[PDB]
Design an enzyme around this catalytic site. Structure first.
Site, PDB file in Angstrom:
ATOM      1  N   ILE A 249       0.866  -1.218   0.000  1.00 39.06           N
ATOM      2  CA  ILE A 249       0.000   0.000   0.000  1.00 39.06           C
ATOM      3  C   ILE A 249       0.889   1.250   0.000  1.00 39.06           C
ATOM      4  O   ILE A 249       0.816   2.080   0.891  1.00 39.06           O
ATOM      5  CB  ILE A 249      -0.902   0.004   1.247  1.00 39.06           C
ATOM      6  CG1 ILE A 249      -1.511  -1.391   1.476  1.00 39.06           C
ATOM      7  CG2 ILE A 249      -2.027   1.029   1.061  1.00 39.06           C
ATOM      8  CD1 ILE A 249      -2.306  -1.836   0.243  1.00 39.06           C
ATOM      9  N   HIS A 250       1.735   1.384  -0.991  1.00 35.97           N
ATOM     10  CA  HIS A 250       2.639   2.570  -1.053  1.00 35.97           C
ATOM     11  C   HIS A 250       1.914   3.756  -1.730  1.00 35.97           C
ATOM     12  O   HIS A 250       0.722   3.928  -1.557  1.00 35.97           O
ATOM     13  CB  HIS A 250       3.955   2.194  -1.772  1.00 35.97           C
ATOM     14  CG  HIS A 250       3.757   1.978  -3.251  1.00 35.97           C
ATOM     15  ND1 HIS A 250       4.554   2.616  -4.202  1.00 35.97           N
ATOM     16  CD2 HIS A 250       2.895   1.183  -3.956  1.00 35.97           C
ATOM     17  CE1 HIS A 250       4.143   2.187  -5.411  1.00 35.97           C
ATOM     18  NE2 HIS A 250       3.141   1.316  -5.313  1.00 35.97           N
TER      19      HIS A 250
END
Length: 87
Positions: free
Chosen positions: A13-14
């Site tokens: 989840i960057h």
């Protein structure tokens, strides 16, 4: 209003996935925030999610709190099933 999603994306989840989510919850005025590593960041925080650095094999807790808080949690949900970021 809240739902626990499972993180199984390769990149995690960057910033890329943080931009897809901030766009969904953005349309919803409800205050939906994600939870990770005991840190609750506003779903509308692409730079704030980078500090978490989520990866594959993790868990996240989302909670919508506002007017259409229910419409926001299901919105980001269908987005996670469209590409496959989490379930």
């Amino acid at each position: 209003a809240q739902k626990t999603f499972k993180v199984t994306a390769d990149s995690g989840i960057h910033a890329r996935p943080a931009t897809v989510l901030v766009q969904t919850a953005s349309k919803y005025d409800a205050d939906v925030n994600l939870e990770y590593n005991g840190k609750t960041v506003n779903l509308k925080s692409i730079m704030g999610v980078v500090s978490l650095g989520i990866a594959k094999g993790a868990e996240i807790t989302i909670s919508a709190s506002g007017a259409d808080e229910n419409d926001a949690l299901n919105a980001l949900e269908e987005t996670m099933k469209s590409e496959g970021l989490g379930e």
